[PDB]
Amino acid sequence: SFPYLGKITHLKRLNHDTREIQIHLSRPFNYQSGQFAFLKIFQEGFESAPHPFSISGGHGQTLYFTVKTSGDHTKNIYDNLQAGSKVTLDRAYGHMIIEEGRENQVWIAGGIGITPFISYIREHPILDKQVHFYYSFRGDENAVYLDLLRNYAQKNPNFELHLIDSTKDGYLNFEQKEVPEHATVYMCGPISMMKALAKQIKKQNPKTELIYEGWKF
Numbered sequence: 594s595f596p597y598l599g600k601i602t603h604l605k606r607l608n609h610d611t612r613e614i615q616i617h618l619s620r621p622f623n624y625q626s627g628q629f630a631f632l633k634i635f636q637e638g639f640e641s642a643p644h645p646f647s648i649s650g651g652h653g654q655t656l657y658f659t660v661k662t663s664g665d666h667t668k669n670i671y672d673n674l675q676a677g678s679k680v681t682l683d684r685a686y687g688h689m690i691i692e693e694g695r696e697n698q699v700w701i702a703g704g705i706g707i708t709p710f711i712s713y714i715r716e717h718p719i720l721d722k723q724v725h726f727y728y729s730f731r732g733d734e735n736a737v738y739l740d741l742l743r744n745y746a747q748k749n750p751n752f753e754l755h756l757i758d759s760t761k762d763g764y765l766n767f768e769q770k771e772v773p774e775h776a777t778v779y780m781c782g783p784i785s786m787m788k789a790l791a792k793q794i795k796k797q798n799p800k801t802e803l804i805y806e807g808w809k810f
């Protein structure tokens with residue numbers, strides 16, 4: 594096969610350091626919520642090296658990515674990326690597949706780790722599972738998609754949101770927190786957070802299925 598050629602149709606700054614990219618693809622793309630792709634940007638003043646970003650929405654020929662400023666290239670995306678610029682993508686990657694889990698699920702996002710969960714929400718307007726969603730962010734200035742999450746909970750009573758400001762309450766802690774074996778736990782966020790929560794959940798709940806995707810923030 595060959596790369597997907599895409600054109601950026603929209604850009605939205607969600608907060609002080611996070612920007613959503615909407616792309617239109619040359620042909621239909623296939624992925625499952627929880628997966629990521631390597632994006633190459635073709636714009637003057639940008640490096641064309643590929644960077645992995647979780648897919649945050651879309652179906653058919655539309656794809657969304659949500660990028661948080663974490664260094665030179667992602668700061669350049671926040672300040673200077675333009676609509677109309679073209680990108681290339683290879684295929685979807687990743688083994689975290691949210692749809693494959695049990696009908697009861699616990700989702701845990703740390704900061705920009707919310708992005709695969711946003712794709713699931715966007716692709717399932719009527720939620721088919723019972724979900725407890727723990728979204729932890731460093732202060733109110735670093736939260737994204739709060740209105741979207743509120744709208745989803747209003748439309749789907751089976752979606753239970755738990756917003757955590759880690760600057761007020763400290764990092765999310767699941768020590769001795771019981772998670773039943775009929776639920777699947779999905780997590781995405783900083784690798785430091787994923788490894789601490791995974792040790793806590795595995796020890797208290799050895800029988801509970803736990804799947805996560807982490808990256809060095």
Ligand SMILES: Cc1cc2nc3c(=O)[nH]c(=O)nc-3n(C[C@H](O)[C@H](O)[C@H](O)COP(=O)(O)OP(=O)(O)OC[C@H]3O[C@@H](n4cnc5c(N)ncnc54)[C@H](O)[C@@H]3O)c2cc1C
Pocket residue numbers: 629643644645646647648659660661662663664665666667668705708806807808809810
């Ligand atoms: C599976 C996966 C999914 C991700 N999803 C998202 C997402 O939805 N939103 C988001 O904002 N960020 C996401 N990231 C992180 C993102 O790829 C990095 O923040 C970004 O590439 C850093 O580029 P930079 O030039 O700004 O920073 P740099 O100056 O390159 O910062 C260095 C750090 O950035 C990361 N990084 C740099 N280059 C790469 C690379 N080629 N491959 C992997 N990591 C790299 C590493 O953590 C590294 O320690 C994801 C990363 C992975 C691995």
Ligand SMILES: [Br-]
Pocket residue numbers: 624625626692713716
């Ligand atoms: Br899916």
Ligand SMILES: [Br-]
Pocket residue numbers: 650651652655656
């Ligand atoms: Br779409």
Ligand SMILES: [Br-]
Pocket residue numbers: 596633681
């Ligand atoms: Br290419």
Ligand SMILES: [Br-]
Pocket residue numbers: 685686687688
């Ligand atoms: Br893969």
Ligand SMILES: [Br-]
Pocket residue numbers: 703704705729730731732735736
């Ligand atoms: Br955050």
Ligand SMILES: [Br-]
Pocket residue numbers: 737738739740741742
């Ligand atoms: Br929103």
Ligand SMILES: [Br-]
Pocket residue numbers: 703729730759763764765786
């Ligand atoms: Br946290």
Ligand SMILES: [Br-]
Pocket residue numbers: 783784785786808809810
């Ligand atoms: Br980290």
